[PDB]
């Protein structure tokens, strides 16, 4: 019911360089993660950052504010998918430092093309349409970048939703390894 | 409120080959108009039909169904505008029989480009966007045709909402004359 | 609960050359009045038509389809105000054939400038605000025409709502005389 | 629920020169009443008309149109109150042909000053508050007239809601007598 | 307001063997059409029946009740698209009698695949998924059949919406010719 | 928009012994069907009746009204599935006179177990549960009867939804044959 | 109303290694449980952790994020069901450290197959159907693992909802023993 | 309005081993109670815990989490009723430590059978109905046990709501005595 | 905009042994009052307690929690009515320690009988109606006891709402005196 | 759930002279940003201030509160866009200290003219249209100032929505450069 | 998602005698400003206080509670408009200490007459209209006083909304100077 008030469980883990990305990606929650990554880089630009991800996706622009932050800060951002990472969630997971992107045994990944909609004069309709297509292109290219797949396989694999088990995500190049380490 | 139960005032006028297009154009009010047209035709393939227009516009697909009917039938469909004839209302107005298109002293005419919208994957967004642009083109061609304005002239003029007074609709070629005839 | 049936009180009265203008002027009720006039002209182009008015105003363009119809048909159109005639109602009342416009003893007349509104890009806001100023001028003129008042007096008098008693509407020139006829 | 059909109960009573005013006085219901009255006169300029009133009152201009019509036609309009005659209801009841104004034994009549309201710029508020003030005076003038009460006495009596039994109404002058005729 | 009465306009045209399919296809509007068809077969099993179509589609099973009736009855059912004809509506248009499937000059046609959905246990989801798939093959074979296009050409082409102009439909083989027959 | 009048489309067909079951089955629409069946039997006990079914199913109690009336009247009741006959709709389809139960080419039939639900004290929950279980068995017994399937079969096959094409239905004994007779 | 202000009652029990799973499983609450588990593992990697479960189930993805964490952390996680543990709650209950899974005497457990629902194109329906089915298999497999039951047994037993008392849960293998230790 | 800020009057009393059960029972408030009891046990396993009860009852699975905790902890849980203890509340009241259960002079108790409900397929209805019947028996058994009443006696007496005054509740064995101790 | 924070105005007053019962009595606000009293008694078993009351009353069981506690605790509980003490509010006031029950000068007290309302089967309607009659009896005896009036007198006096001024309340025995001590 | 509570992540960054502008610009978030800027200045007048921007746009007046404050304080305010800067967002981005305006590699920028609306008398509509136009002018000028494009170029480019990638914004003079700085 | 926690930015600024006025004026935000003013005066009755104004206006009565407090306290209140100051917002800006009222360069100011609206009896309507007028006279009197304009000038200027750019506000006498101080 409350952020565990032992000092706030989330603040407790942040000092262990752990950041959670959960639920719908949107401007405010995205801003909150940018702030956290900034403060950790401030604490120490050499130590890795661990970003946990459980997300059905969300607003792209907001996801990109997180994306650019990850690439720009000095510390390596290791991504860990628990539960799911769909659409923009799956993009941010493959955005982690190569070699440091993981999936948990039973997590699921889902990738797809962008969604949008506009209403107005046809002229305006053409402008907003040309825009979403550019964004799709940029996104498709970045995905091919982080996964190793061609631009064509990606464009083909994102036309309609596509699911991946954890192993399939590894073979796909979305993620590097699977974290099992039991006990 | 409903028909002036003398028969119904509107029914009384149909026997004089008179028809009315009032309010928002849409499938049902449209089919109704088409019915009176095929009907008046079956009754007499040579006498004129008179279609009065007072509309703010409506569904393009619904308006073209009327358009094509006007064109297809033998009787000349004389067009008269009272109150207003905006958007698709202005389209059907100028689509009347040549020399038989009229405007009342204080009617307000207005033209513009297609309105539309959509929501979905960018791949489907492109499909519907490209579609409305084709409609924009077809319509532009038809306007140029009935008005005698160059295609580009039409394009330049319908990019943003354009109003014409009765004296102006005539100089523009949207209608042939103004019915003043006092008393 | 419904129209009185002697043969529909309204059609029955229409045979006496009587038409009623009641409540909100809007497209459909405006159209019903137009068909009726048309009809009464076809019946007898020489005999006067009587239009009772009890309305608070309405959609200008709708009222204009009626204005133009009155001016255009052969038979003079006499106007009688009962209850009230405000905004478009007052206008249509003063638009009756010269010498055939009346106010019942306790009618209440009201004149004012047009009301309108828009939302959108400033370029569009400017297009629409321009149109609305044209109409206001058209209306100021027509009204100066029928009342015999000066265009400036009209403007001056219509910037803010102005109420007139039946004996004031006669003096202002809005109406020819006051019918009383007791019994 | 629906009208009883021997030939529509009301129409049937209309030929007998009987007319009903029930419920809220509002424009459309009022026009229907005017229509019927004009019809009866057009059928017989000399025979009396019967107007039953069971109403809580309503829109003043709507009722005033009925009032002017009553005073205007050749045939006297006899008024009979059943249930209640409140506000505009009481007004039109007292407005019937002197000598032919009735209350039924358990009728209830109530009189009060006009109610209304505005919203806007203070200059505007002033113009409307002055208009309703005029109508209040007019209404009092007319009531003093019909009841034979002094205008000052009327004014005083109408500030707050005042209830009148059928007998108290006859004594006040609002009505001529109680209709009784049993068996 | 009402269907134009010169004895109910739609009834009049019905006797001239004309039926209208307008707006959304759902059970009851479908039942109405099936009935008028059966009625005309009965009336004269040899003459042509004319089905005008202006629709975006709707419920499949309901469209099928109309499809199977057209096929069964003796008289040839000619189809004429006016306005639009998308999804089920396009299917029905191409279902008409060969050599008798028409398109108006500016009519717009759009073909696509079946839409649907479920909520429940996974076992139940499997069942409804399998069903919708079979209805897909079925619908493709039937369209293949009517157009002359191959099954695959039909599959490929309908996987996502596909709009077609009148000449394009006449060349895809949805419609046979275009009714220009001007005036 | 309205029931077509050659003399009411559905009446016109009633006289030729055709009756339609369209939409969700519920008391009132069921009542209308019962009334029509009674009417026809009362017109000629020896002529067959035709019941066209296109329904998703509905209230069991109400469908059973139609079912019992089918078995009781003297005329054989021939059932024709068009569109779909799902649940209680399929039930009533198979209840037609043996040898006169038909599926149109693309008709979709669907069979299943009953649905229900209660809220309240456990004692009453027990009562109501027990009742639907009784109705389940009865419905199974009867379906077995009309189809020729073993009770165990019918039980097995109906715990979860089951779809059937016209030919599978025939095969199943739910229907006798498929109607195709073209032209 | 609020928590126990004595420095937050729950943080207090957290410091004794106790975590509560209460209500519907969903992303955010599930994230809070993951935080606490890591925090506890940090505090001490070999001491046991106690997860109290009182839940009706919920979103699978959110629950699986919990599953993977329990398995990944070094500490053994003992699970205790108080109240209920239905669907995913039960799935997480059995997921506890073998020998350390408990049920309070009157807790109820319930297991069932996955629920779900999509809306869309048939091509997208098959994709979502394939995925949900894959999920079912993985889920039965894992359950058979912790219960010691055969995969066909579980498939058989989860087709429809199955309830179990504490004793039946122990004897079934979802939990090891019942906790009672009265006093 | 707020939690009495003298360190929260509730937290304060908690140090006097005082817990309060108030309002409707459900998962979260129930969890708050479990937490408090566990903390108190730990705080001192041989000291008595006082649980006040003013509740109309609520969710059974939730109330049972409390019941099983009361039995488990080493400290005796004394139950005290104020206001009311209805259904599950009364159940929990009688579950207090023998010799340690009370009612205030004007407290009112009420017992009744379980309430429940379902919607769905008959097969499921039976599964869900069979389970509420089992929980009811289980409930009747624990009640007989704490009251000393016979199973059959509880069964009969709980069929419909049965109210008990404090004096009556002592006699029924639901509670041990009545707290009065004035001043 | 919050409790005045000089240390939380209410907590601070609690130190002066002052407690407030404001507005609607309901389970939660009542519990808060109980906790306060038990706290104070615990702090000093001997000194008076002051319960200010400004209530229109509320739920009976809720107020009874409070009453029974007032009588239980050793400390006397002086009551002071400010604003109003209606229904249950008036009850709690008269229940204060004899001699220590006060009313402020312009306080209003209102006494009445219980209000209730049930929905269901006749047998249940009876079990419930009977219970409310008992509570009414129990309440009347208690009020009689505290006021010194006869049981029969309170019974007469409370059938319909009874308002009493502060001087009237003192005469009735509801309150002992009126606090005024100004300066 | 809460802004990461390690002294609040945002306040922590605030002492590092960072300020975030996220989501819709509106009076209140605007004010918050004005206070932070004035605070930073008071802290140290010559140290740069960093303002992150991720906004879809918003209220002009609100945004100008920020703009005017930025220019007015002594410290330079460097601007950084993450996610997007559309309309007023974009405008405030280019309003940053010359040489100190940046874009992350994947940000999107969009520029356009003012949106607005009014409803009222024609005299007030003009008043309001004039004002919005004045604002369009003023903003177009400031836009030219900061970017280095001609006034005419800005106008030609803001008439309809115009999107720009990060490098495109660099070449347009809206931002000085792109940040990428990896590791 | 919470006020800037560096000790609460506003209080931080409050120690610097900075008070903010943002959004619609109403009783509570105004009471807050008054309190901040009283407090600051307490601290030092000689020093200046700074009131930042960004407002569309609001409740007059709330505004005057602020206006009167400003004239009353010992310290000078300098007013600084940012964004906008319309109606009551503008009135309070011109009320600052003569010589200490400023506009940021792009501040937009708006002046107009009072707004209002009553509902009720004509007698009351007049009481309320005469009141809004006195307030209007008083607001104009005070406006002239502060700006240095004549009463008659202010009246002419406030009969309809009048916008002022920062420079015009200065030229008009509403504000003393513009603030620009850069860097």
Curated annotation (Swiss-Prot), chains A, B, C, D, E, F, G, H, I, J, K:
Recorded domain comment: The N-terminus (residues 17-34) interact with ClpA and ClpX.
Predominant subcellular localization, coarse grouping: cytoplasm
GO biological process: positive regulation of programmed cell death; proteasomal protein catabolic process; protein quality control for misfolded or incompletely synthesized proteins; proteolysis; response to heat; response to radiation; response to temperature stimulus
Keyword Protease among record annotations: yes
Regulation: induction: By heat shock. Part of the clpP-clpX operon.
This enzyme's EC code(s): 3.4.21.92
First-level EC class: hydrolase
PROSITE patterns: CLP_PROTEASE_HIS, CLP_PROTEASE_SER
A Pfam match: CLP_protease
Active site residues of this protein: 87 (nucleophile), 112, 161
Location(s) in or outside the cell: Cytoplasm
Subunit structure: Fourteen ClpP subunits assemble into 2 heptameric rings which stack back to back to give a disk-like structure with a central cavity, resembling the structure of eukaryotic proteasomes. Component of the ClpAP and ClpXP complexes.
Disruption phenotype: Cells undergo an apoptotic-like death upon DNA damage characterized by membrane depolarization. Decreased persister cell formation upon antibiotic challenge probably due to increased levels of MazF toxin.
Reported function: Cleaves peptides in various proteins in a process that requires ATP hydrolysis. Has a chymotrypsin-like activity. Plays a major role in the degradation of misfolded proteins. May play the role of a master protease which is attracted to different substrates by different specificity factors such as ClpA or ClpX. Participates in the final steps of RseA-sigma-E degradation, liberating sigma-E to induce the extracytoplasmic-stress response. Degrades antitoxin MazE.
Gene Ontology terms, MF aspect: ATP-dependent peptidase activity; ATPase binding; identical protein binding; serine-type endopeptidase activity; serine-type peptidase activity
Species whose genome carries this gene: Escherichia coli (strain K12)
Alphabetical keyword list: Cytoplasm, Hydrolase, Protease, Serine protease, Stress response, Zymogen
One Gene Ontology cellular component: HslUV protease complex
Reactions performed catalytically: Hydrolysis of proteins to small peptides in the presence of ATP and magnesium. alpha-casein is the usual test substrate. In the absence of ATP, only oligopeptides shorter than five residues are hydrolyzed (such as succinyl-Leu-Tyr-|-NHMec, and Leu-Tyr-Leu-|-Tyr-Trp, in which cleavage of the -Tyr-|-Leu- and -Tyr-|-Trp bonds also occurs)
Name of the featured protein: ATP-dependent Clp protease proteolytic subunit
